[PDB]
Amino acid sequence: DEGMWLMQQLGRKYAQMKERGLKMKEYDLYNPNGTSLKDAVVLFDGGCTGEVVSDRGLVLTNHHCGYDMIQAHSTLEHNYLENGFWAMREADELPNKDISVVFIDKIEDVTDYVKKELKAIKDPNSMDYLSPKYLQKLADKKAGKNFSAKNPGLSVEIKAFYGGNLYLMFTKKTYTDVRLVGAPPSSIGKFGADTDNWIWPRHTGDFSIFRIYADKNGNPAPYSEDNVPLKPKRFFNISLGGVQENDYAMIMGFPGTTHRYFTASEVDEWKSIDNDIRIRMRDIRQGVMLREMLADPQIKIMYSAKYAASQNAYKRAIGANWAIKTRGLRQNKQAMQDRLIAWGAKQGTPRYEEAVHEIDATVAKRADLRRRYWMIEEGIIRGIEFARSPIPTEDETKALQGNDASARKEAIDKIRTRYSKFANKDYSAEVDKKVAVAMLTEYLKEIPYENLPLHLRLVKDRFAGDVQAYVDDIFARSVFGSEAQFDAFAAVPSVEKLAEDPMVLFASSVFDEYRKLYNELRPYDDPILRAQRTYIAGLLEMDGDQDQFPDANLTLRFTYGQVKGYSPRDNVYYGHQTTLDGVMEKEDPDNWEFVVDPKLKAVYERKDFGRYADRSGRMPVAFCATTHTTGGNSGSPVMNANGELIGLNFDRNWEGVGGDIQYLADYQRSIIVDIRYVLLVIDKVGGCQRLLDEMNIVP
Ligand SMILES: [K+]
Ligand SMILES: [K+]
């Protein structure tokens, strides 16, 4: 069901949750002064979500959330990324540099406090009401003198909600000794990762396992061998019961951003500028990279990760534009603004209509600048690798202006480091030239001569419109066009040559235009934010908050729904549950994405599923639910009707990515690893019994 709800809204939503099958008492899910399931949810390393699953501080999150830590501990001798990792005693769990988990110890509505303090600010158009520095000064004032000394590991933050109409203060408890305990092999953790990104059905065992360490009283402490596992106030019980179609499911976690209050004009702008440009420019870039990767196996090795990275937000933009085209997103926002405008007229209060018209007018005024910004960002800053070639600093240019040879040597050395990082082992000058010719052809079609970065005016003025000749000239003459050209430069460095370098002048020119567009566009954000404060206040006055969730803002939310598949297209149905049979159907030993771990294959051959399969002998892998998630919900716990852990959220289907603007009941799903499959992998693949024995596994 729709919405990413504040914990304060649990009372408002409880009747709807019970209608969908919730059996918990409200207090046990969230309460403000006691212990609740909210106390087992953590913010994992500043983006992801995770959950406490034992009375000794065991934490589950996704494999993709734990990846950087698994990779940091991996070597040729112990390649944990490929083999997995299973600590067979607590003393073998691996500490992690610069890691955190954050508990939300307390939440408080401070709206009246912040609105009182904002009365002091004289300028009615001040943006201090949304300023992180200003709200942190209010938090510090409220928490009082020596809050930190009186509360080990605790800190406070105030955040704005509903466009500045509501403020909450969070008291956060931060642990920095968080050790790696367990991870499946990447073949399981990343099964289908690029090909199946944003796809349901999905077959990925996307989990990893950490443990929170602390002092002997459970307070946060920096890494020490004297630290002991946290004895937490709440952990999740793990259900062996499984899921069935239509079962209630709920999620808690930290969704980052939504746009539920876009005007119709903002939907049109998101389609016609942001998404259309991203789709067109990435289709060009990807099409050239694919052609070069198919033709040369070494180019495939070098460019595979850059290609999949481009494809990530490409696929999301295609899904978002699909929803705008087919699912009525614009008309939904048109109806929302039309309803409030009709009500405002009945109330004798034109300020809501004025707010919608101010947003419309700002969107219309910025259209050509925003188009230019997205064209340069997708077409060149992201699109063309040599845009990020080195630019000598003034110090470096002075340094080899001079006759001090040793400062000169030091300037060349600094430049060499940036060149080596640019033209690294994954960089092909030939691929970059082909990509640049295709991307600049599009860019020069769309951006008129008078609005070009100055260096690009040389295509018309010096090369007679021949983009291939222009790009050929950059690489031919630049000291960064090849390793031999850089080495020749480093040997007899000419200050005149460097100031005239066509790659340096190209890079400088396109970053200059990008910067000047950014600076001219930024001011247009503020009138829309101020109008949204009014627009959202009207919507809330008119219809209340029960069916109007506040946009995500990196804070703790709950969502509820049911375990349920969907029909993507005519005569096609995707059910609610994938199985291990589906992993084996997808097995391809010559595609890294679809390798089946040999212990997992033997488990499947033997039907060695313990108590983790269904009664018919089918071993679950993933399920999907009608919960409302977005980026920031990776790793989130999935609870059944009784609050027991049934899975871990790890993705969303592409049909649902428009759901940041408008939830789609018949299309949007959260993609979740079944906890039964996590237990099977710990047991039969890791052989790590002590982790099963420390959990509370309930029927
Ligand atoms: K994804
Ligand atoms: K988002």
Side-chain angles (χ1 to χ4, degrees):
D1 306 33
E2 184 172 339
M4 311 181 188
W5 299 105
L6 303 177
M7 305 315 298
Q8 287 62 45
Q9 286 171 319
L10 176 56
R12 295 293 273 142
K13 300 304 294 181
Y14 186 63
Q16 287 166 293
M17 301 165 78
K18 280 180 53 54
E19 288 166 20
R20 298 298 200 180
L22 176 63
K23 293 306 180 55
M24 294 183 75
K25 297 309 200 319
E26 183 177 328
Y27 178 90
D28 296 313
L29 179 55
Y30 172 73
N31 62 56
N33 304 124
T35 303
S36 65
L37 231 38
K38 169 275 277 175
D39 294 311
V41 181
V42 298
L43 177 68
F44 186 89
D45 209 40
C48 283
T49 306
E51 57 267 10
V52 187
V53 300
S54 86
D55 65 19
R56 289 186 70 76
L58 205 69
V59 170
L60 302 187
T61 190
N62 293 153
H63 184 271
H64 72 257
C65 298
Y67 192 93
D68 290 353
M69 298 90 202
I70 300 162
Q71 177 179 60
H73 287 294
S74 294
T75 67
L76 281 314
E77 177 258 284
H78 52 64
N79 191 343
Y80 298 138
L81 264 193
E82 295 313 295
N83 297 332
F85 172 78
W86 305 95
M88 300 300 279
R89 53 191 179 129
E90 294 184 341
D92 298 348
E93 304 164 353
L94 293 176
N96 293 297
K97 193 180 94 160
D98 299 327
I99 195 166
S100 70
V101 299
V102 176
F103 290 84
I104 303 307
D105 193 59
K106 303 287 173 185
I107 316 169
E108 173 182 2
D109 191 312
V110 296
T111 304
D112 289 348
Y113 165 64
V114 172
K115 284 187 180 165
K116 185 162 190 274
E117 293 287 329
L118 286 166
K119 296 299 144 290
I121 295 173
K122 299 147 57 92
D123 182 1
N125 291 356
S126 174
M127 298 313 290
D128 282 353
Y129 76 107
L130 300 178
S131 161
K133 266 151 194 193
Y134 175 81
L135 295 174
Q136 188 67 48
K137 288 185 186 83
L138 294 193
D140 293 336
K141 172 173 177 178
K142 180 143 188 89
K145 62 166 288 155
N146 309 135
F147 176 77
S148 181
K150 284 165 55 152
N151 302 270
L154 298 189
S155 62
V156 292
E157 184 176 13
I158 287 173
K159 299 277 288 189
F161 299 77
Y162 281 125
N165 289 292
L166 187 146
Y167 293 84
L168 300 182
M169 184 161 80
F170 298 84
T171 306
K172 300 170 287 177
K173 185 180 301 187
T174 306
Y175 295 80
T176 70
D177 189 357
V178 177
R179 304 196 191 165
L180 177 63
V181 177
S186 279
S187 68
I188 294 178
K190 292 191 69 176
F191 195 78
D194 295 330
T195 297
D196 293 348
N197 186 20
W198 310 110
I199 302 299
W200 183 249
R202 190 68 151 284
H203 297 87
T204 314
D206 198 341
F207 77 96
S208 62
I209 312 176
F210 293 79
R211 188 182 308 285
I212 304 161
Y213 280 77
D215 76 13
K216 283 180 187 180
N217 288 285
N219 303 121
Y223 167 67
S224 164
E225 279 180 73
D226 295 324
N227 288 348
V228 298
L230 175 65
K231 297 294 299 175
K233 76 155 171 222
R234 181 61 83 234
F235 64 90
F236 284 97
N237 290 341
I238 308 293
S239 178
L240 262 189
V243 299
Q244 292 173 285
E245 181 181 12
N246 296 325
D247 277 1
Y248 178 88
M250 63 183 162
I251 285 172
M252 284 182 282
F254 296 85
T257 64
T258 55
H259 301 290
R260 170 72 173 58
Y261 298 95
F262 264 6
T263 62
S265 59
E266 285 176 292
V267 174
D268 284 349
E269 171 185 59
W270 179 46
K271 191 275 185 189
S272 66
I273 297 178
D274 310 11
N275 285 345
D276 276 353
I277 294 166
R278 177 166 287 171
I279 288 165
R280 176 60 174 150
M281 293 301 199
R282 291 190 188 208
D283 189 33
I284 292 167
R285 190 191 184 213
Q286 287 162 190
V288 174
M289 290 192 172
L290 182 52
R291 175 180 154 92
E292 295 307 305
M293 288 188 291
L294 277 162
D296 186 333
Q298 175 61 1
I299 293 305
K300 184 167 181 173
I301 280 162
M302 291 162 71
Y303 276 78
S304 281
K306 288 182 263 196
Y307 179 87
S310 181
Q311 278 280 182
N312 176 37
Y314 173 78
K315 288 170 171 171
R316 180 163 64 85
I318 289 286
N321 269 13
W322 172 84
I324 299 173
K325 183 167 191 260
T326 71
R327 305 273 67 86
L329 265 51
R330 184 203 196 282
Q331 204 26 77
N332 175 292
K333 302 304 165 192
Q334 187 69 58
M336 188 167 344
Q337 67 195 58
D338 286 341
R339 181 179 171 82
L340 182 67
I341 288 174
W343 179 85
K346 277 189 28 65
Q347 300 285 126
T349 62
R351 65 180 190 132
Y352 306 116
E353 186 170 358
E354 289 176 357
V356 172
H357 289 163
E358 281 170 10
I359 297 166
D360 290 345
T362 303
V363 166
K365 192 172 171 188
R366 71 183 181 194
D368 199 62
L369 289 162
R370 192 186 178 101
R371 179 183 89 88
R372 289 162 61 186
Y373 183 80
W374 278 82
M375 285 289 186
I376 202 172
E377 191 175 69
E378 289 283 340
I380 301 184
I381 305 307
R382 293 174 174 283
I384 296 172
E385 291 177 283
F386 68 84
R388 282 194 183 281
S389 58
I391 299 167
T393 66
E394 22 184 304
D395 287 340
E396 288 163 1
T397 306
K398 287 179 196 294
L400 30 72
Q401 201 90 238
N403 286 276
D404 172 353
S406 218
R408 296 212 324 152
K409 169 67 186 145
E410 142 146 299
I412 301 292
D413 277 1
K414 287 148 77 194
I415 294 172
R416 188 179 282 278
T417 297
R418 298 202 304 287
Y419 168 67
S420 288
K421 210 250 191 83
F422 156 61
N424 72 10
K425 67 203 225 300
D426 291 333
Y427 181 73
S428 171
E430 294 303 305
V431 172
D432 199 31
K433 288 173 44 173
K434 290 178 168 74
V435 170
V437 168
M439 299 290 274
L440 295 174
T441 299
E442 186 75 6
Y443 181 86
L444 291 163
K445 183 172 55 66
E446 290 303 325
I447 305 300
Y449 180 93
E450 281 301 310
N451 297 156
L452 290 175
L454 298 190
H455 197 261
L456 277 167
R457 290 174 175 172
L458 293 171
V459 176
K460 178 175 190 288
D461 289 342
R462 183 165 303 171
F463 296 94
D466 187 337
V467 175
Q468 185 74 55
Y470 168 79
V471 172
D472 284 347
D473 176 75
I474 291 171
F475 278 77
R477 293 197 302 103
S478 176
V479 304
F480 305 127
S482 75
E483 175 148 44
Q485 288 169 204
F486 182 72
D487 286 340
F489 165 73
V492 174
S494 162
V495 292
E496 170 169 336
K497 260 298 93 77
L498 193 60
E500 304 186 313
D501 191 278
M503 198 182 298
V504 173
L505 290 175
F506 173 92
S508 292
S509 192
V510 300
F511 270 94
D512 284 346
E513 180 67 22
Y514 181 51
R515 185 180 69 255
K516 293 180 175 190
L517 289 169
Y518 179 85
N519 287 334
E520 193 177 348
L521 279 166
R522 205 218 287 209
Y524 292 83
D525 295 332
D526 295 352
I528 288 169
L529 287 160
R530 293 192 299 265
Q532 285 176 331
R533 181 174 60 209
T534 298
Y535 182 36
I536 296 167
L539 291 167
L540 286 178
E541 187 168 356
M542 180 178 62
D543 285 335
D545 72 343
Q546 188 160 65
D547 294 296
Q548 296 191 110
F549 79 95
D551 274 323
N553 69 344
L554 298 163
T555 67
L556 182 64
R557 308 295 180 82
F558 71 87
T559 174
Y560 64 100
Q562 289 186 344
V563 177
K564 193 67 165 190
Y566 70 103
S567 171
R569 63 186 178 97
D570 179 56
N571 197 42
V572 178
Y573 195 74
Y574 298 157
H576 70 280
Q577 179 100 76
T578 62
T579 68
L580 195 54
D581 308 280
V583 168
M584 298 309 149
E585 287 164 358
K586 282 184 180 180
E587 179 178 2
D588 182 354
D590 305 322
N591 182 356
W592 67 269
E593 288 195 71
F594 293 114
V595 164
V596 174
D597 172 85
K599 290 188 73 182
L600 184 66
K601 184 72 175 280
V603 160
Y604 177 79
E605 290 168 344
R606 299 194 306 274
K607 309 310 168 199
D608 189 12
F609 302 148
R611 296 196 303 145
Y612 308 124
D614 78 10
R615 173 62 180 90
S616 79
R618 286 24 189 270
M619 183 62 224
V621 168
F623 63 91
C624 68
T626 67
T627 45
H628 191 180
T629 57
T630 189
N633 274 119
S634 282
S636 296
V638 186
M639 287 152 274
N640 68 16
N642 289 134
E644 300 153 344
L645 196 72
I646 49 166
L648 268 90
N649 184 60
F650 71 98
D651 206 5
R652 251 185 304 163
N653 61 329
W654 67 266
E655 302 94 322
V657 298
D660 292 354
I661 283 65
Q662 186 47 49
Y663 176 77
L664 297 175
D666 296 331
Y667 293 90
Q668 177 166 4
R669 299 292 179 263
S670 302
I671 296 176
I672 295 158
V673 57
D674 194 310
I675 205 68
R676 290 172 292 173
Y677 187 50
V678 170
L679 300 182
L680 176 81
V681 174
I682 293 169
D683 186 346
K684 304 291 181 180
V685 175
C688 206
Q689 185 62 37
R690 71 181 189 92
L691 301 182
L692 306 171
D693 295 343
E694 75 173 271
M695 304 166 170
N696 190 38
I697 299 172
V698 299

